[PDB]
Design a binder for this molecule. Structure first.
Ligand SMILES: *[C@@H](O)[C@H](Cc1ccccc1)NC(=O)[C@@H](NC(=O)OCc1ccccc1)C(C)C
Length: 220
């Protein structure tokens, strides 16, 4: 596979968004992965509605601001036959009744692919598919205050993930410890967080923070 991948340079990725004070990371991860696959198919990058998923994907198993799963989000778009754009169905950071309107749907998918729980398998998917939805253990003060460099948290769990994010690539950079590989991760905490809203997470370091444990993408 390539040593370095950055799907932002290919036009697959919208600007960093902000979920606010709502447990809806899973919806931002899902829209990001679907935004990439819709671009792959149509050549048009359109921001998609997280509020659509928060409000409407309950029947697939999601719980709005109280958590959810990207796979469930991908299931909703398939079962629902569409997903509205972000401009038509903007984000309110609160759970409301479903207001989906198919006339403003800009995205569809025919299911989703679960990536084996191997960092090598995740690398193959990022190199060939596009941005991938992943779950990580982000429940550490070090993650809140991250600014730059490769993020490594010794107390991160590979099995207790609590935060959905989007792998848009991977790469390397020389470091003190010679642990130079990283996943390029788009967060949904606004661009003031981290590096323009992005973080470089340690790659090939015992599945750090569980990044390969719950990876998937929509089929478009
Ligand atoms: C990210 O904003 C969100 C925060 C949160 C963590 C734990 C519990 C609630 C909310 N993280 C997730 O949604 C989390 N999902 C998760 O733990 O899946 C289990 C689940 C919880 C609630 C409803 C349905 C499933 C990420 C995506 C792993």
């Amino acid at each position: 596979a390539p040593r370095s991948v950055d799907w932002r340079e290919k036009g697959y990725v919208t600007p960093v968004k902000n979920q606010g004070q709502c447990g809806s990371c899973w919806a931002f991860s899902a829209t990001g992965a679907l935004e990439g696959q819709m671009f792959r198919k149509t050549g048009r990058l359109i921001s998609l509605s997280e509020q659509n998923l928060v409000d409407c994907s309950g029947p697939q198993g999601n719980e709005g601001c109280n958590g959810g799963l990207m796979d469930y989000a991908f299931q909703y778009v398939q079962d629902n036959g569409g997903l509205d754009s972000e401009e038509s169905y903007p984000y309110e950071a609160t759970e409301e009744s479903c207001k989906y309107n198919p006339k403003y749907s800009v995205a569809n998918d025919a299911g989703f692919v679960d990536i084996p729980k191997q960092e090598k398998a995740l690398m193959k998917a990022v190199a060939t598919v596009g941005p991938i939805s992943v779950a990580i253990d982000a429940g550490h003060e070090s993650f809140l205050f991250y600014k730059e460099g490769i993020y490594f948290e010794p107390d991160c769990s590979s099995e207790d993930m609590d935060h959905g994010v989007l792998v848009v690539g991977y790469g390397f950079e020389s470091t003190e410890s010679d642990n130079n590989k990283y996943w390029l991760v788009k967060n949904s905490w606004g661009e003031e967080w981290g590096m323009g809203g992005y973080v470089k997470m340690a790659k090939d370091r015992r599945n750090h923070c569980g990044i390969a444990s719950a990876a998937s993408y929509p089929t478009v």
